Design a binder for this molecule. Structure first.
Ligand code: A1I50
Ligand code: A1I50
Ligand code: LYS
Ligand code: LYS
Lengths: 462, 462
């Protein structure tokens, strides 16, 4: 109902030649600037620094000759204003009382004082924007459908938003320091490769064909390696047309990273440093406070284990690349399609879930890692690692497969379970230097670091 | 045919227990590093700095006991190697001759010398990747279908790639210095607004509905302003499902920028500074050399003109918001749907095309600018500017419309030519502070700056 009373104040403001949505108000300072400016003012004293401030009125308290309000700047910083009859008022004071509702953006020019709390006493004031909706005084799913309100009302929403931003910047900063070049590769592709997922498809009017939103940048990033990029990354959305859960969303921001003349051993080190550097820059500790109340320590060195041996220890018997699917099925049964899949699942069900401290698992089944080079010495496994951090499957790195003939096979096997990515394969046949790539999810990153859900870490999900 | 001879060398290398795609080669330096290290070496003298280098063999010259090759590192830097019988050879020399074709990535450990040109004489050497395709010794449309080869063979492809990267970084650096925060807003939207374009649509399996790839981030970026972001930008792809031409592609990278408590006058200034700063960082001059052979000067201050007056001067009569479509049709006819459209078209046909120096045109027809605030004083126009740089329609800035009721109208008018963006409108009714937004295309930016076509400025178009 207050919807309608607010709409009428708009109408009657227009009519009176007051401007409720003016083009310009001469804001001299953010409220934060005024605070940092007057840190320790003798309380109940005036100073002749005149400012023009603007802010959301989130608290009113009217009292005849004198009205107080809390201006909250968009970052959360607060300044109190005092609308007084004696300063420049009467009609001003009336208009204040009549015109100014909660959630209204307001500008006030005046002197900076402290009251019997840091305030601005007003010479001038003006509405900067009239709200036709009061703030609520929130369920998780209304906070997310209306992030703009969440951000106005809930400090933590403000902090998380800025945290993601700072994390993302930390990442770019870390990679740039190391000489990585950030490239833009295509989102719309004639066929979407680089990972295991069902694509989003869209019809192009230009070309009268379907195109596919990228599931991952790998294959184009690999083209950049062919083309002589020494060190490239890309930090941007990918689209996997599948179901949503606590670690999975159909649209999400992902980092991929490619470095010539290093292996999975090298990118493991960088990934660790990168994450640690992000924590330091964006969180300021490696002793990560959780909503739990607990503390997760990501400092120091991180353990590396091998999938097959670690699984072997867990299961009480030697599991190798040679172990049959009939054997693995049986073990699987005893607990409650193919070899590679069974190993990963058994590993995930036994070793995976038990990991607390940050851990790399390396040396993966060849069948489930089409894009990663075969191990330099161990038969039947690929040089891939996964990083688990706080129990979250965070990141992966590969010693990348550059052999076009092997690579054509790996894809043929895939397809039989038949048009391949011929251009990708062509690029490889021009020669790709030995190189190691990583992938890492930003939401999972933030999750692993903070305890926040995926639906808190993106500004505008659905 | 050489396709097949190369494939056989792979096969016979495998067979002999040589590794043609090894996991790791111990590369100590980039060729650029070795160059910077030995800038002025007395030519035809040896030095006992041992290095391990790796590079693409792009030139061979075999001669009995001694073979020379050019290693080109991926950035374009060149080092010559000398494969000699006397160093560590005979069988080595034979294998070199037999095993190493052009476009092969090769590693060589050895001493750094200058010959009778900076070279490495080899103790050791190894194939790092075997190419199953020779380099061509290129049409514009094969360069772009195979950028990876373009990048190997054509220096200018290398330079342009790195230029775009440096421009994009320059942009982020410039905006960050000014306190802008880069946000990620959704690419997949329930309805795609913020501009005039037909969307790409994609079916979601998760939600069993169509989604729309964003045509622009504005409406979500505006939500961020509501939510208290003072200064936000987003630099990322947008998708407009329309035809391709020399200034238009269906997928392209675009910058949008939002700043609270400034107007179009303010963002005009920033846009100018931003562009000038980009030129300085990424190109190193504001006297822009063109393929033409000419020089385009983007230094100093840029002229601002008004659409209606400038058109009036061009046409020899007063054109105002009040001029009828019947009048404009007639004028249009005399040269060779609605008022706003006719003004822009007439303006573009008369004043637009005649502009050489960098120029802002401001004060636009209300009918064609649904999202921009009405002018503070001039009836019938909005506070929008377009920037033309080197004749290219580069950028725009608005004093943003924050009035939810006016905004609902503007959208209603649009739709009648009927479901609106209710959530966007809801956000506005929570109150958006006065603010100015800009948009700018990266490809157009690069084009305006360099003379390069849109099909050179993106790494992987199609
Ligand atoms: C929300 O994040 C994700 N959403 C989806 N749908 N899928 C994935 C993620 C996500 O974070 N992923 C990681 C990306 C590479 C790093 C290794 C672990 C995962 O594959 C996969
Ligand atoms: C290649 O760049 C573009 N491709 C398409 N399809 N459409 C546009 C571009 C492109 O650069 N645009 C600008 C974006 C905002 C700045 C004002 C001028 C244009 O609208 C529009
Ligand atoms: N494309 C991978 C990430 C890169 C892995 C290293 N080449 C994924 O989506 O899983
Ligand atoms: N969305 C605009 C760019 C931002 C204009 C300022 N609000 C466009 O695509 O034209």
């Amino acid at each position: 109902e207050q919807f309608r009373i607010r709409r009428d104040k708009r109408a009657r403001l227009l009519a009176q030649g007051r401007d409720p949505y003016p083009v310009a108000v001469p804001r001299t300072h953010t409220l934060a600037e005024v605070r940092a400016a007057h840190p320790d003012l003798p309380i109940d004293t005036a100073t002749e620094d005149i400012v023009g401030v603007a802010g959301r009125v989130i608290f009113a308290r009217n009292s005849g000759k004198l009205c107080f309000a809390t201006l909250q700047d968009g970052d959360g910083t607060q300044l109190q204003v005092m609308i007084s009859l004696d300063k420049v008022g009467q009609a001003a004071l009336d208009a204040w009382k009549a015109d100014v509702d909660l959630g209204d953006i307001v500008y006030v020019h005046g002197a900076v004082i402290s009251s019997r709390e840091l305030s601005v006493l007003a010479d001038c004031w003006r509405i900067a924007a009239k709200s036709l909706r009061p703030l609520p005084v929130m369920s998780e799913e209304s906070r997310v459908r209306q992030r703009y309100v969440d951000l106005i009302v809930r400090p933590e929403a403000r902090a998380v938003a800025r945290l993601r931003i700072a994390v993302v910047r930390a990442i770019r900063t870390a990679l740039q320091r190391r000489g990585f070049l950030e490239v833009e590769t295509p989102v719309l592709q004639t066929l979407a490769g680089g990972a295991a997922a069902r694509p989003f498809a869209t019809h192009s009017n230009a070309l009268d064909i379907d195109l596919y939103l990228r599931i991952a940048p790998e294959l184009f990033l690999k083209r950049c390696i062919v083309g002589g990029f020494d060190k490239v990354f890309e930090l941007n959305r990918v689209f996997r047309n599948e179901g949503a859960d606590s670690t999975h969303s159909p649209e999400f921001s992902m980092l991929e990273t490619y470095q010539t003349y290093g292996t999975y051993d090298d990118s493991a080190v960088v990934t660790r440093e990168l994450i640690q550097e992000v924590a330091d820059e964006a969180i300021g500790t490696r002793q990560l406070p959780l909503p739990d109340g607990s503390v997760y320590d990501i400092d120091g060195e991180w353990a590396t284990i091998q999938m097959y041996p670690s699984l072997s220890v867990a299961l009480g018997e030697e599991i190798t690349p040679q172990t049959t699917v009939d054997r693995l099925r049986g073990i699987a049964d005893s607990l409650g399609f193919g070899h590679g899949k069974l190993i990963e699942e058994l590993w995930e069900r036994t070793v995976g879930k038990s990991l607390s401290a940050p851990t790399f698992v390396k040396d993966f089944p060849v069948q489930t890692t089409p894009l990663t080079r075969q191990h330099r010495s161990i038969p039947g496994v690929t040089e891939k690692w996964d990083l688990y951090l706080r129990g979250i499957e965070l990141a992966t790195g590969y010693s990348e497969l550059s052999d076009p003939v092997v690579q054509r096979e790996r894809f043929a096997d895939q397809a039989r379970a038949m048009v391949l990515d011929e251009d990708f394969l062509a690029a490889l046949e021009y020669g790709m230097p030995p190189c190691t790539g990583t992938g890492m999810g930003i939401d999972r990153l933030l999750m692993s670091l903070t305890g926040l859900s995926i639906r808190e870490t993106v500004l505008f999900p659905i």
